[PDB]
Amino acid sequence: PGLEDWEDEFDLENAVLFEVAWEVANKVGGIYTVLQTKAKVTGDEWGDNYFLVGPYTEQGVRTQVELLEAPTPALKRTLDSMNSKGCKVYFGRWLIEGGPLVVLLDVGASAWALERWKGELWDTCNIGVPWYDREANDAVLFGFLTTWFLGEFLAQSEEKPHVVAHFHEWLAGVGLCLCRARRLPVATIFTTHATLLGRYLCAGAVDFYNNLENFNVDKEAGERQIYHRYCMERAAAHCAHVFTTVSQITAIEAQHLLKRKPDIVTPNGLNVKKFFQNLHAQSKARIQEFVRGHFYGHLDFNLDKTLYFFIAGRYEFSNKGADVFLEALARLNYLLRVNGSEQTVVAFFIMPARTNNFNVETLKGQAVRKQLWDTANTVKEKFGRKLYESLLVGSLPDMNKMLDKEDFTMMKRAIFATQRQSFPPVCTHNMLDDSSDPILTTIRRIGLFNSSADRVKVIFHPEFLSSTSPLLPVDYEEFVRGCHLGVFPSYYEPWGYTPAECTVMGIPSISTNLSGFGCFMEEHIADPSAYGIYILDRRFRSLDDSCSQLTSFLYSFCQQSRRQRIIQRNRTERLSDLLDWKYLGRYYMSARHMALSKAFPEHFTYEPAAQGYRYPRPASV
Amino acid sequence: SSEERKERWEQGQADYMGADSFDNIKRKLDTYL
């Protein structure tokens, strides 16, 4: 089912959508990609009545925004006015798939108003940003500039349209609060993509989710010198016609930290066109060549029985669950050894870290694999030419005479290059702090040294995968498509971008019910594991018990036949439509309709989601 | 109070356990809602 026909009974009444985010036209997070990929559907629903309001940055305009003249006289008039009133407001087209119009506000250009604005802010919300907080002061400037733009756009518009302003973090929350305080006619959505407290409370506290009700949010933000940022976020959530979260776990966090249950959850959709079995085969061949190089001299395990697990994303050890994955990898190593399995699990940790360079053993192993591959290819081409020559003369090859002295010299050189005594390095790079690295510390603590006995090899690649890289000449998407199972046992993950992209790429993944993507899949798929989606229970299980469940998931994945693994990959391939904005734009549409009805009930009435996007038991299981 | 409260906000953490708690903020915001 399409997006244009969703809530088609709703008439926007020539309303104008101002989507306000600090990340509009400047990549400072993952919300930039959310806005970029959602712009297509949003502009389809709103045409040119859709404006992304961002902060002006020289890089963003240089690279992403073509500066334009306002299409309508109202926009041009407001832009000229506030440009003459001491602000520096740019208008342009964001050079992305949607081609949306962007109002960019130079917050620095209008810093002169800061003291009169933040004081004004204190006169309306009792929120006073400390001077030393650059981001909070910039948020106040951006919010006051956005509210100025909205007021001067409604004032300088004869038709006086219905304005839906959709703010996306506490950085835009100030403008939201000012829209409500000035009382100008704006239907307001507030989407929080991550509760501000949530990050600190997960990182610091031993347990954060089960203690959500037992948190003094005011006090907790107070000890961390971010009380003003917390108050800005909570006022935006409070001063919003519609409050939205990207996830149901973020919805719980916002309920217990922003003291407002989201009126709707708007999961982060994706442009699935951007992203399976033959492509997976090529990527798996490339991973297999890398593993051949990395384990040169130690290729004593069957590679056709080798499984490629990966955990990727930002190098947040506990938030991304790399600790849980490593514990489960040690337990699965024990399981595969005691069960005497011929299965091998190479688990990749693609988590960027400060690295000096590629480890010498890693680069040497890649060189050794290249040499053996070239030697085998040269000897194979010589053998093929000689064999074709022999068969052309009706002669059966005499294999003893097929290879000459030069072939044996090349092959003996290759074999000499093969010998190694040291085990393959756990990490592919030179860590600036090997002792303090959580992944390497955990690996050396649990006993995963890529030994021959270890059925689980661990390859920590503390750097993003790039095609230009010498070690792995593969970008992240192709490597992932070559893997068997993404493992993202995240503890704190308001939305799982890495597991979501893994799923869109058709790779079975392990997420958690503590992650937004994991909750979204758990509530959209009847039997997620059937579809390649393992939802680890991290809310209601201890870290040790969650490690046990992850080991169970990894072991059951290892114990699948190749036929079962293929069936499961086909199902996860089917799952990609859930994560497309063509479905997840429904929730943004309904949030905007809800806000319009709340702010303008006389003009709009809202009639309350996953219809056509439910995945029951696969018919074939 | 009031202006002194604003100056305390600007210098550092305010009385997040007292007057500058989110109760007063929520009231001064609900007046707008």
Catalogue the E-assigned strands of A398-475: 429-431, 456-460
- Region of residue A394 (left: phi > 0; alpha: psi -120 to 50; beta: else): left
State the Cα–Cα distance between residues A612 and A501, nearest whole angstrom: 21
Fold of the A15-271+585-599 domain: Rossmann fold (3.40.50)
A254 closest CA partner among A215, A205, A300: A215
User: Inter-chain contact A217–B20, Cβ cutoff 8 Å?
Assistant: no
CA–CA distance, A52 with A100 (Å, rounded to integer): 7
The count of other CB atoms within 10 Å of the CB of residue A84 is: 8
3-state percent breakdown (helix, strand, coil) of chain A, nearest 5: 50, 15, 40
Contact A537, A522 (CB under 8 A): no
Name, in order, each residue with C-beta under 8 angstroms of A65's C-beta and a sequence gap of 6 or more: A25, A90, A92, A93, A94, A95, A102, A104
Q: Are A170 and A258 in contact (CB under 8 A)?
A: no
Return the exposure string of A212-246: e unless at least 16 CB atoms fall within 10 Å of the residue's CB, then b: beebebbebbbebebbbbbbbbbbbbbbbbbbbbb
**Residue A93's beta-bridge partner residues?**
A66, A101
- B10 vs A contacts (CB less than 8 Å): 118, 128-131
Backbone break loci in chain B, preceding residues, C–N > 2.5 A: none
Q: How many residues does chain A have?
A: 621
Amino acid letter, residue A117: W
CA dihedral sign, ordered A131, A492, A269, A164: negative
The DSSP letter of residue A457 is E
State yes or no: A565 annotated in a binding site: yes
Residue A450 tokens, joined: 């890529």
Distances (CA, A) of A167 to A230, A468, A469: 16, 38, 39
**Residue A286 to residue A290: CA distance in whole angstroms:** 6
Nearest alpha-carbon partner for A9 in A612, A609, A605? A605
As a whole number of angstroms, the distance between CA A280 and CA A558 comes to 18
The reply to whether residue B25 touches residue A235, judged by beta carbons under 8 angstroms, is yes
Residue of B nearest to A258 (CA): B22
A-chain residues near B13 (CB < 8 A): 222, 225, 227
What is the experimental method? cryo-EM
CA B19 to chain A, closest CA, distance in angstroms equals 10
Structure tokens at A71: 């299409």
